[PDB]
Structures are given as structure tokens and as C-alpha cells.
Amino acid sequence: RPRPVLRSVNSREPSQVIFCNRSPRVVLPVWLNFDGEPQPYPTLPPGTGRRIHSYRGHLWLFRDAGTHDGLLVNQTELFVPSLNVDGQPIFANITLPVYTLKERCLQVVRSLVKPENYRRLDIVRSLYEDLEDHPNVQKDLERLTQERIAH
Amino acid sequence: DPAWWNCFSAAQQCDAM
Amino acid sequence: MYVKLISSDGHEFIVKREHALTSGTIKAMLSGPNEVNFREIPSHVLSKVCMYFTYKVRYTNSSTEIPEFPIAPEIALELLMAANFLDC
Amino acid sequence: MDVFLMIRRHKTTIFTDAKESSTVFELKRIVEGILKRPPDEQRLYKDDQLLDDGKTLGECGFTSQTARPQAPATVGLAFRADDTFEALCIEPFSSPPELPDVMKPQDS
Ligand SMILES: *CC(=O)Nc1ccc(NC(=O)C*)cc1
């Protein structure tokens, strides 16, 4: 209720991090600052890597740079740097998630028709709303927070 | 457990003392 | 165990049960009082739907590099309506 | 390593998976468990070339990069009518309709 909890500490301890883009999308790396607000960072082309100077105990989420589609890193949602034990840089293998076929079909249609034509399509009622409900990071953080609260 | 499950839970306990 | 899924135009798709139970809608049609008819789903859609069953059963939990699931634009509108209806 | 297949005859379409180091006869066993017909009553085809029983799927041309999940490779099938095998037939799928006036590229 006070501060959002999906956030990074100011641990001041450096950490070597490498983002690998094992996805066909243009990945957008995102760092949540010490207040929970997401900071975007330069995009990653598909199949490319990059060493990144982040810090021990930060948070990183990755999305499609154009569509904001959700992406998994190391098979999970968020990524946490840590100590570099004996040289070792930390790998953040960004991957696609196994989308639901519904959300996947919306992904394609959203990339063909553009907003004002979402309601120019002869489809069932509760689908224009799903088309207009684009993937949102700020709301997926609210969801990701609300999910684990019950645990 | 994922590395961010601990990142969340440690904040909740620290932030809301 | 194999189940059979029929399209409207008359194609017979036989897939494993764990594959068909990916769709929650199909879990109920064959829960018990197998073979299922889909009289508004053509063959070119139900075939792609059957591919997604194999796609999810294969790549869920798998630590491999997951590739894109392709959808052609001409079938994107129909596959969406089926995906909404079939719930998967 | 793992290959994913569409065994097709007329309007029947079977989805299954095998491994590259498995023979065509072993795949004819998989169909026997499904369609209740013995291997000697089956003839498997890649497009229109008859695949013999002794060879593996990888040797027949079903590599993991072509027999993928999201895009499985079609495996032709023909049964024996009386004492002579049928003509290999796979009924095509339904055709999608015209792409709407909106979903077209349009950019000059
Ligand atoms: C008081 C405080 O800052 N707790 C806190 C916040 C965030 C994190 N995140 C990670 O360690 C990744 C830990 C503790």
C-alpha cells in the first residue's frame, strides 16, 4: 500500500550481466528503479547478446519493444543479478513464453489492423475489448504483485 | 524458487516493517 | 490415448488425449456422460489448432529455446475466434 | 532428435511424434494401434516417394528442422484394397476466405 515492492535495492555492489535474445522479437530490457518505476533500456535485436553493468539485487523484465508482448527470462518473469563467482558473468536468456493461442492470435491481428479498425472487424462482441486490451507492463506488475500476495 | 520470488518477499517484509 | 476431432467440412483429426485436454472446452465435451464434432470450425483452422496442442505439450516447462508459433494472416481472424471459443 | 508428423489419408489426419532413430515399420506400428491395420497393409509416403520399412525417419528426410511441432511434416498413407493398394490420396484442407479490406499491407 505505501511503496510498491517490485523494486531494486541500492546495493551499490556491481554485477556483470549478459542479455541473450533467444526470441525472434526485438526485446526491450526494463529495469525497475528503487521506487518500483520501470526504466527502459536500449532494445536488443533477435539472436544478439550484450554485457550489461547492472548491480547486485536489481530487477529486470523484458518485453517486445513494439507490441509490449510479455517475454520470459531464464524461464521466469523477472531477473535478479547477483555475485559474479570467479569471473562468471550472469546470463539472462530472454525467451518467448508459450502464449495462449488466443493471446497469440491477438498478437498477429494487432500487428495487421491498427487501433481504429479493431471495431471494423466482424467478430464476436468480447473480442474488440481483448484486441484493445494491449499488453501492459504497469498492469502486469500489479497482477504479478497481487498473485504472490496470497502465497 | 525463482530468484525474484525472494526479491519480492524480502521487500514486503522490509518495506512493511 | 487418442481422441478424434472432426471439422465442419469433414476432416478427422486424431490426437492424444493430453493434447486435446489442453483446451478447457474440450475437457468438458469428453469428460464423460472419444469423438468430438466442431460444426463451425473448418479443417484449415482445426488443423492449426491441433498443431498448437503439440506446440504447448512440447515446449511448456522446456528450458530449450522456444520458437515462434506462426499464424498466417488469412487464418488469423478465424483462429482467434476458435481460440476464444475453444479456450486455449 | 524428436520429429512431429501429420500422417494423412483422404480426410483423416493423425498427429503423432517419433524419434529420428526409429524406422518406418515402427511408425506403421503406431498407425496399427490407431487405425487397427497391420503394417503390411500400409504404405507410407514422403510427398509421393514410397518409404520402405527398413529405413529410419531421419534417413527418409524427416529431420528435426522439417518435422517440427508448429510445422509438422506430412506423411502420406495408402491402405490395401482387397489385394492391391489404393492410390495415395490426401484430401486438401478447406480454403480460407478473402483477406479483409483492412488486413492488407498498403504502404506507398
Ligand atoms: C528495505 C528493502 O529495500 N528491501 C528489499 C527490496 C528489494 C529487494 N530486491 C532484491 O533483492 C532482488 C530486496 C530487499
Numbering used by the authors:
A (entry chain C): 58 to 208
B (entry chain G): 1 to 17
C (entry chain B): 17 to 49, 58 to 112
D (entry chain A): 1 to 108
Please give sentences taken from the publication describing this entry.
Here, we report a general and rapid method for discovering α-helically constrained (Helicon) polypeptides that cooperatively induce the interaction between two target proteins without relying on previously known binders or an intrinsic affinity between the proteins. We show that Helicons are capable of binding every major class of E3 ubiquitin ligases, which are of great biological and therapeutic interest but remain largely intractable to targeting by small molecules. In addition to possessing increased stability and membrane permeability, Helicons are capable of binding large, flat protein surfaces that are inaccessible to targeting by small molecules, and Helicons have been developed to target a range of PPI targets in cells and in vivo. Characterizing Helicon-E3 co-structures and mechanisms of action, we identified new binding sites for α-helices on the E3 surfaces, as well as potential probes of the disease-linked E3, WWP123,24, highlighting the generality of our approach against this therapeutically important target class.
